[PDB]
Design a protein around this ligand. Sequence first.
Ligand SMILES: N=C(N)c1cc(-c2ccccc2)c(CNC(=O)Cc2ccc3c(c2)OCO3)s1
Ligand SMILES: N=C(N)c1cc(-c2ccccc2)c(CNC(=O)Cc2ccc3c(c2)OCO3)s1
Ligand SMILES: [Mg+2]
Ligand SMILES: [Mg+2]
Lengths: 227, 227, 8, 8
Amino acid sequence: AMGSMERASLIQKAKLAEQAERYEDMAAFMKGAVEKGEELSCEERNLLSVAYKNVVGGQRAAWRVLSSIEQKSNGPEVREYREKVETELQGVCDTVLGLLDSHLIKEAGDAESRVFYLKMKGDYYRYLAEVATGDKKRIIDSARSAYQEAMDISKKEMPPTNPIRLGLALNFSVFHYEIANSPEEAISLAKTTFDEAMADLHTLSEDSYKDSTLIMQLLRDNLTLWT
Amino acid sequence: AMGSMERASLIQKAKLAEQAERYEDMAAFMKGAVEKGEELSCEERNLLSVAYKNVVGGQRAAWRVLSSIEQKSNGPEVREYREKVETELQGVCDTVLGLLDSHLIKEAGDAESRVFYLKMKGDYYRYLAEVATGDKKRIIDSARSAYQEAMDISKKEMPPTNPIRLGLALNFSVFHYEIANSPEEAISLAKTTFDEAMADLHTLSEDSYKDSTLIMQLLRDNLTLWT
Amino acid sequence: VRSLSERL
Amino acid sequence: VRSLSERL
Ligand SMILES: N=C(N)c1cc(-c2ccccc2)c(CNC(=O)Cc2ccc3c(c2)OCO3)s1
Ligand SMILES: N=C(N)c1cc(-c2ccccc2)c(CNC(=O)Cc2ccc3c(c2)OCO3)s1
Ligand SMILES: [Mg+2]
Ligand SMILES: [Mg+2]
């Protein structure tokens, strides 16, 4: 439905939707922009990610509420409604994965863009894994493979303080702890990421230092919760 | 699309949607319940109101953000997107007004139900008036007429501390101040409502006292802002 | 600031 | 409590 709107207008409307907290509209505008077929800039990649993170985040929060109610009850209404929300969540994840596969990842040559999209791929397979059962194994391996490829590129091409590299390592650690039942892998990754970033902070400007230390704080918070 | 679901299941799903903060779903379930053609209980009326208040509240907040951006700019994007949100808001208000007119109000014989629905009618015409221009006059008179009929019934049939009567008077005072450019009418209504409720608190149980005083606090907050 | 209306 | 992932 966005095929008749100019790319630049879709991006401008995504920025307005963000200010208006209209995240479903924001995601639709950014999907339209991606479907124009041009690569996305750093700012545009962040708009895409913010839009879908907010949409799927609301769905995940709703699914967790309904799943909790359903687990305590063990009529069909709670199960039926949890299934409805689950199907909608899976549809949003499939949409994002489809944009990544057709054709954002294959056209991303720079490390910053390729790592960003591969991290997103890991994240949306992770959200699928949160609701999957038994099928679950295959989704988990898809998330792991995307995160691992992103990690390999990021370690070769980015400094340890780069915010994309840090956010990737953070989310992969969450994958290990919450999805893959590998809490020791999660703790090891978070600790090594934190320590390597700490030792690189001296190279950063005041602004970059703030960016990197904010994400490092999340690594430390998880380590506190996990140990 | 809800015509094939049992009334009781729609109500149960509305309650679940509320807990999951899925207010669009909640509104759709309650619309489906209303369209079964039976009158609504007090609890069901509150579910209907909560669902649509949350849906239109998000739209109103977005419209205000976009209208503010549009006013500062004076390309077509901000206007076009504000118009899109405005049209969606008007559609939600028209849906609620249509449920009230077909046929909730005419079937409401008790004062509690008739006052509740007439207040809702005033509220959704008020939300239409917030975005209307010039057409604006006719919407304003429709809101005023609904609120006034509700007031007349409430003064004859309910005590001054009844929460529906208090919320009606509160919202009618907001109408006078923000929509009808009648700030002195707003102040007079809020003051008289507050004082008459104060003098009736002695009749209430501890629970009812808490209910009534919470709404009275909003009357006092407005009087502070308005004077 | 805007006036406060009935809360849920 | 659940683990914290990357924030916007
Ligand atoms: N509209 C939006 N939402 C954004 C637009 C742009 C933008 C990008 C390029 C040019 C112009 C704008 C954004 C830039 N954000 C980042 O690059 C990542 C980041 C870095 C450090 C952090 C952090 C996140 O969280 C904790 O510390 S966000
Ligand atoms: N699911 C929901 N949202 C609700 C279900 C029921 C319910 C009603 C009847 C039977 C069972 C449940 C609700 C009852 N609320 C009121 O009647 C109005 C009210 C009174 C005093 C106040 C106030 C609002 O705000 C400030 O003080 S709300
Ligand atoms: Mg073009
Ligand atoms: Mg039936």
